[model samples]
Target: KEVLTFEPVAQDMTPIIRSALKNVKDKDLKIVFKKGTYKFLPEYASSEYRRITNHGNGLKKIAFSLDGFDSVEIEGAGSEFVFHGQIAPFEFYNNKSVKVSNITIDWDIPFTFVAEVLSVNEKLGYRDVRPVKGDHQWDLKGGKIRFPNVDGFSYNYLGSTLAWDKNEKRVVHGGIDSKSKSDDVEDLGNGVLRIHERLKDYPPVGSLTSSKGDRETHRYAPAFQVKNSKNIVFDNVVIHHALGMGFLFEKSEDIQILNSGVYLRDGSERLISTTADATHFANCKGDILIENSRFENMLDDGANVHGTYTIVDKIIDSHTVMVKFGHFEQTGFEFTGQDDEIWFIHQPNTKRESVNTVESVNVINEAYTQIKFKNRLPKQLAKGDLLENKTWNPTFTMRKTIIKNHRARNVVLKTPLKTVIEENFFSSMMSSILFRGETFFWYESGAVEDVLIRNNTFDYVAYAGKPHAVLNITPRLSKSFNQDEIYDRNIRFENNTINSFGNRIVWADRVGGLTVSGNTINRNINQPVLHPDSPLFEFVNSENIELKNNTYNGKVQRVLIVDDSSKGTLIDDGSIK
Candidate 1:
């Protein structure tokens, strides 16, 4: 009484399949899609009224919500579900024991470069900016060059915008403030327009990377999301061309992703792939494992897993502070609990300041939560200070989370307790791996302990003169917050092979209880285009950091460099020069 079979239908499969899956009263049932391509129309797929239920915390509304179901096994068996939609393809809510396998979900929406004209007489940095219009402000119809609403740029401010390379028949970096003169786009012909900005480096022709952009770039949503689910397994799944982050999981547990892959459409890997991380896991706990998965050509980090750290919107008083709630909060969202410690970090300055023990928490509403500190601060709290939940975080272990065969960028493991990253291969990357702690960027903070990163390979990394090292460890806090007690501890980095072009092979800031041994670091200092005399290993304000039995090569002025550290800086049995 609880079986479903989906055959090819001439009609739109969005509403049909959605109704079938939600209507099935049977538990322990199988939904099989026979071998054929099914197209989901964009009109029904992008319907706003069909959203699945997320936490109603008065945050941004969930997009393209798939109604949740349970105990369903979907076997596509090599069939492809083509989504002609603008939002995510699949979403599961509060599901249990769900198994999705052997299927391909292809986002069939073609990529388009959107452009927008500016508002009236807005100065592009003290320069009189024109919208390339006529006397009537409408000489010709102008399109908007919309950049995707991602967090940051791939190359900071130095990144470029997407443009059609007429010779190559693909998109390339259309740089307005490009270092070279030829990269500027002054004319609207030749399929080129730019973000008008004023910079000393170049003319105000375009803005390659910034927080603002035209409307077209912010149009799409993520590919999939799972919330408050358990016992979820995704095996042998292929996701092609995500419009946004490939998958976002929140407050889920017992998850396993095996032999899965995420890819960009051909010729758009550099620009028009998934706009953010390939997959993001937040507030998920218990027995999580991702093995033999491949994520390549993504615009952001390959993956990110952490908890929420809200920003202090306004300090009501010395003790009572209002913090932001909602937007990726766990399914069962709450502001704080009794006797919980919250870190009040002043972002932008790296001095490690925001550590406040919560005396009490008050949920003012979905918009903001007011918190009272046990002890008042010595100084006033400014805007952009972060408040991270030090409790109710996640624990994970990743072994055989294999990456190789192709190349990508940053793999960030922020506050994963008992995490193991071993047997992974890295050929080419922007920045290799980060054992990051707390930050103002995302306003997240947690204790990252018992981490083991061994038996991994880094062939060529930091291709764009980036994150400076292959393995960078830091709380990313400020200098004032650089206490040993608040730093990430109990980390073991050993038996790794790195041959990379970077400033250093490994870096740490305020890291303690450390053991770095049996690793071979070969630096390609000439290739990374960094400053002169960058070292092999750099540590700042750390203690108990031991280096032993490691080998180095590929030309650096110094092998080991330590600065501003307190204790246990022992370098035993390493060879260089």
Candidate 2:
């Protein structure tokens, strides 16, 4: 074991650190930083070709590229690591154990820009705006804003916009417009621009607006990315800004995030923190724990935990089948390995046909792979069926966390292992918790087998009025709802408290064995009820639902409503309002 200490030089530390890591011979190493600010510039950083999932494929600039080590610890001792331009700050690739703590990661100039709305003329269809953060050269052409130069970065279009209420200091309910475009623009000199566009929801005067590029361009750089690593831990770390997710753990296991946060800098005018999800875990096994963290003002979900679902493209023989990555961003990655268990799912009904062990996997291209099974494939296996990596599902636990003011759901759980979500505070724009297993669109798979959600506090969830439920479970099964075939099973919601401005509590479909008990619901007076006609609980194509000992303080006409496809529902007398 050896220790190396580096102090802030107020210069580019990219080459200095890269050379140190490249020449260090100790397998167990400790890199400590003095309590100061360090800058990492892209031109001085090392470049490498990486095939990142849910991101564009190309050479990426990385500051600290740690590849293949036994044990490593980066002790930042309350230091700040400020990055410049588009670059990933840290990359831990195929490490045995890594621990990072007491650091604040941020960018000098973030990719996402924020501007304040000075005035708005709705009848004239224009708004006068001034840049607050992320200053760059603005080029307006053909009714679109473009950033031609900003510290060696360029953007052809200013994509998706979110309206931020300056007074409330949060995202305006349902204020996201992925297709926000301007018709014309007039430069008012300085940093103000008079933009012309017809928006259904015009940002009010004194409010703010934030946007990066669209999905295609914004998800290129992350703060910390761990690939094929195990026993990774991030503690007491804070990320103020990132081009992509704050943390992206791919094909990793035994991850823990403790007392860390992804949040906007205090007293800053920036309306957004990370450009994408705060944290994302894909195809990770073992125990995943997230505790005592705060996630706020991110563009996407707070966290997403799931595995990929590839579609069967061709059947070469009885045991060999060709599979293709369904989503374009999910391509260019190895999804399975030899001797890994894989499940064949009938997409039409979301039913698992059979499970088989993999013998070998051959990559055909970035989008397709050929998988040979150890045993004979299922007889009903055909093209368009889904293949799930059963060996990579992780048991998840998230407690003592806070998620608020995000665009999408707070957390998305799509695993078959046992899960527990408790003692969290959520006040998000969409659903607090989302259970999705889809085969066609995003291709995130796995039906949750057992889940316990208890002792949590949800405030004003679904205020954006998009997902329409506090907890939403909708699996895209490629066909209509089938009572005989359910996807998720044994999900219990107990002892939670919800302060909602909507009527919908739980909206589920094709779920078996759900229990909601001992929960308390109260109507929130701050916001208006968005879904007035919807029931408190709605079930479709689900069976064996039991609601008992629940209490609500609202006058609801319908407590539980079930579609004709659902059956075997029981409600205790006087259990609900």
Best by lDDT: 2
> Which residues of candidate 1, in runs, are more than 4 Å off?
26-29, 46-68, 112-140, 143-220, 265-271, 311-364, 370-391, 401-409, 478-486, 523-528, 564-568
lDDT of 1: 0.57
lDDT of 2 by residue, 1-577 (tens): 8788999864989888988888888878899999999998888778998888877777898899888889889999999998888788999988999899999998777777577889989899888998774433356556566653556566655668878877666777655554466657788988788888777777767878877876677788678889999999999999988888899988999999999999988876667788888999999999999999999988889999999999989999999999999888888877998989998976465777789999999899999999999999988887888899999989999999999987788989998998999999988777788898876578898799999999999987887735468888888755432434788998999999998665478998888888888899997546666556777898888888888888888655467778776745644455875
Candidate 2 Cα deviation (angstroms), residue 354: 1.1
Question: Model 1, 1-577: lDDT tens per residue?
Answer: 3777888876567777756655666556677888989877655443443222121222222323434556657788888877653555766676777678987766454332323222222354322223322111111223222222123211112133332223322222211212211122234444334434544443222322212122233324566677777788888887765555676677677788888867644543222345556777776666667788877545556767777666667878878888774344332355465777665556444334656678887787555778888889538577666666655455655555544322234577776367777887764344577766554344455557678888987766654323457777766543344345436777888899887554567778777667888888766534534545667778887778777788776555566677744345645455453
Q: Which ranges in model 2 have alpha carbons more than 4 Å from their true place?
A: 122-124, 133-144, 189-191, 479-484, 554-558
Candidate 2 global Cα RMSD: 2.2
lDDT of each: 0.57, 0.83
Query: Per the 3 Å backbone cut-off, how many clashing residue pairs does candidate 1 have?
Result: 20
Q: What would the TM-score be for candidate 1 when compared with the true structure?
A: 0.73
Q: What is the TM-score of each candidate against the true structure?
A: 0.73, 0.95
